[PDB]
Design a protein around this ligand. Sequence first.
Ligand SMILES: *[C@@H]1O[C@H](CO)[C@@H](O[C@@H]2O[C@H](CO)[C@@H](O)[C@H](O)[C@H]2NC(C)=O)[C@H](O)[C@H]1NC(C)=O
Ligand SMILES: *[C@@H]1O[C@H](CO)[C@@H](O)[C@H](O)[C@H]1NC(C)=O
Ligand SMILES: *[C@@H]1O[C@H](CO)[C@@H](O)[C@H](O)[C@H]1NC(C)=O
Lengths: 165, 227
Amino acid sequence: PDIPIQYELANNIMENYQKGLIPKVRKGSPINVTLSLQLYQIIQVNEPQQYLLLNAWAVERWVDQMLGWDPSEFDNETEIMARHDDIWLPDTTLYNSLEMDDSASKKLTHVKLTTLGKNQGAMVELLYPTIYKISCLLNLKYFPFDTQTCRMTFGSWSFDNSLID
Amino acid sequence: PDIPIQYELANNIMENYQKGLIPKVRKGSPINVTLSLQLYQIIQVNEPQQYLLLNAWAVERWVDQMLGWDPSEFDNETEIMARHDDIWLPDTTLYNSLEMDDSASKKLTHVKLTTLGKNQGAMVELLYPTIYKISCLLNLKYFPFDTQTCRMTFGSWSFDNSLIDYFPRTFTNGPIGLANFLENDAWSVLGTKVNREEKKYTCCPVNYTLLHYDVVIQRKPLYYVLN
Ligand SMILES: *[C@@H]1O[C@H](CO)[C@@H](O[C@@H]2O[C@H](CO)[C@@H](O)[C@H](O)[C@H]2NC(C)=O)[C@H](O)[C@H]1NC(C)=O
Ligand SMILES: *[C@@H]1O[C@H](CO)[C@@H](O)[C@H](O)[C@H]1NC(C)=O
Ligand SMILES: *[C@@H]1O[C@H](CO)[C@@H](O)[C@H](O)[C@H]1NC(C)=O
């Protein structure tokens, strides 16, 4: 009554959660993660050290099978915002990266949860800006009329596709 | 039933564990650690400051004698993933390193545990990328036709070989993997070597193990000759 409904909703959905382990309740299927990228700037191209610096926005979407709730029980609420430290997140990694510290190349603040049912889980969306230091081989044979192609590789560092896809 | 089996498995295996101390249950033998390295890039060679910058991947394997479980009790599960902060890890150190902060030269995320039995422990594997700042002496007498050799020394900073032992793991083409190496525009790699040595403390009658990795690089003088 005199407290936000978000307090009760978070207390209800955060009761039995353990963020240190993957929330896989169904044995048959893995967890599907969808990734999209938007390019905003090309900061620097370094030929002697063979790396490329980019500024981009990344969006990841997946379904958490342990964070579902019934909207009718909570004043018909179908959305909530939680800190990224509270819930489990997939380990999306750039394989050919020249930066070892994630605090200088990423910024995670919040995630959005949309319920799918009491026993169906919730949809999790994570959007954050990032700066990528990508190491790519450069061919300077036709300088200054040269064109370059650098590849970005994304995936899971420790989980096989039977767990995260 | 309505919770992941990983929850129960982690709660079972994490009950009596203390990550701040070495998990040595058997008195007779030490803990063996196997290390392998793969080279990906040569970022910079600095002659005035006498250091070399490399980008490499490191894999370490050992057996933890306190993290065993019976697969049949947990829905026939034989593997699990845990954060590196939860369990004990050996202190593998590069002796001739010019970097004091490990957050800018290493990135540890997760470890993989494979059970060997309820009372036999589990096999732990740790893979992570790293950037090494190696200080090596450079001889510029034959510049620009010079070749250099810098050594990498690995071992335990505080534990003698009666507690932690180190062994090298080599690849098909040599001790250091070069199948995914990125070609440098100024240096070429000729070969690699590995050597395992036991060294004596100069205050105590105990030994410790050191691993020596040798990399031979040769300069390309075409730019200087033509310029
Ligand atoms: C510690 O390392 C030294 C390395 O010298 C070992 O010394 C060897 O000892 C054996 C006999 O135990 C000799 O046959 C070898 O010739 C010695 N090595 C050399 C290079 O001379 C020593 O055994 C190791 N273990 C200890 C001291 O407990
Ligand atoms: C949503 O739930 C609230 C419960 O507080 C109820 O008063 C309201 O009528 C519901 N609206 C709809 C459209 O179901
Ligand atoms: C593995 O253990 C499970 C226990 O849930 C059992 O149902 C299954 O038959 C076992 N399979 C084998 C091959 O032992």
